[PDB]
Amino acid sequence: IPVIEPLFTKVTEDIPGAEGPVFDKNGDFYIVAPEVEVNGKPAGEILRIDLKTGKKTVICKPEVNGYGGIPAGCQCDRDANQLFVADMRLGLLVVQTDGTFEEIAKKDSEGRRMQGCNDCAFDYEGNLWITAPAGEVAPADYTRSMQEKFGSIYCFTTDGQMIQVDTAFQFPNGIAVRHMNDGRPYQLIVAETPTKKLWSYDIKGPAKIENKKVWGHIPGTHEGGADGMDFDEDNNLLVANWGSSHIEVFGPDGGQPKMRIRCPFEKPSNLHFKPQTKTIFVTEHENNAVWKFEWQRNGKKQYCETLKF
Numbered sequence: 001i002p003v004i005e006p007l008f009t010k011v012t013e014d015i016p017g018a019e020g021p022v023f024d025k026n027g028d029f030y031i032v033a034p035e036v037e038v039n040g041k042p043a044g045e046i047l048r049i050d051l052k053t054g055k056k057t058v059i060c061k062p063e064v065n066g067y068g069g070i071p072a073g074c075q076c077d078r079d080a081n082q083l084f085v086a087d088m089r090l091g092l093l094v095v096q097t098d099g100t101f102e103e104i105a106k107k108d109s110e111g112r113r114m115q116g117c118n119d120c121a122f123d124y125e126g127n128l129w130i131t132a133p134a135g136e137v138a139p140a141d142y143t144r145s146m147q148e149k150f151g152s153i154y155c156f157t158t159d160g161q162m163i164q165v166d167t168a169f170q171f172p173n174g175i176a177v178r179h180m181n182d183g184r185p186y187q188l189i190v191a192e193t194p195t196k197k198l199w200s201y202d203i204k205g206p207a208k209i210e211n212k213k214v215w216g217h218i219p220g221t222h223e224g225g226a227d228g229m230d231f232d233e234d235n236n237l238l239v240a241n242w243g244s245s246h247i248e249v250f251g252p253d254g255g256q257p258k259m260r261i262r263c264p265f266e267k268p269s270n271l272h273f274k275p276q277t278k279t280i281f282v283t284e285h286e287n288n289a290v291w292k293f294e295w296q297r298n299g300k301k302q303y304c305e306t307l308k309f
């Protein structure tokens, strides 16, 4: 398997558990710091980064009823410049660029308590697919499915329904949606970190998935595995393989990696393309920093880049 070693340029550092890199509709860059703690309690932050200087600005430190959050993944909305943030303690949040936020749901469509979320991905129809590796949201005691299989997958529909679409995952993490050339949602790809597997489902409609299948295999026997992922314009799936110093590159059909990208750090966590460029920003947990490197082609357009009209 071919391995490339592109030039990585440091953007910023000192961001505990650097995760969820994302660009909003104005081109501003944000990342989350899930591991920031105060007096031993979660006090996660959402930050805006100045790409020119690397200076950081905390725009939101989510907390609900005295319970701090652990923000871990982001997606920018299309019809409004707001961020949807997956939080391991608070569930799903909607954050405005001014720092104000709102809790989306405490319970799902079946009346069951919401589970803590890790990452999310919009399909072009506007539905948000979310991974939930944690147990019940605060005030419930914090727990995670790294050992036991209780991680779930949700779909937050355009008509505002929070539906659990599947469960029994051992730490579902990264997630992505493969679209057809005509823009129709085709497959849902979900990373199960410790098992070194990538799973896929056929998307039949909003919150409707079938044919669960082992889609790809993540290399290595190291502790960790697939974390964050995203597609490039040719539908190649780039996956951060936390713990193995590489970002794996899978072809549209999955299976085994077709190429690997060697990183100058052991723990790549998540990534995101800068709109209309080949530039990929990567967060990593060895130095808790953000880097950028040039890929071979542009990234697949995110939902926020599409036009409603």
Ligand SMILES: NP(=O)(OC1CCCC1)OC1CCCC1
Binding pocket: 017, 019, 034, 035, 070, 072, 088, 118, 173, 193, 224, 225, 227, 242, 269
């Ligand atoms: N980056 P993440 O999705 O998973 C990595 C840490 C566990 C192994 C891979 O976890 C984030 C949420 C909890 C804090 C960091």
Ligand SMILES: [Ca+2]
Binding pocket: 019, 072, 073, 118, 119, 173, 174, 227, 228, 269, 270
């Ligand atoms: Ca993650």
Ligand SMILES: [Ca+2]
Binding pocket: 021, 228, 229, 230, 270, 271, 272, 273
């Ligand atoms: Ca991303």
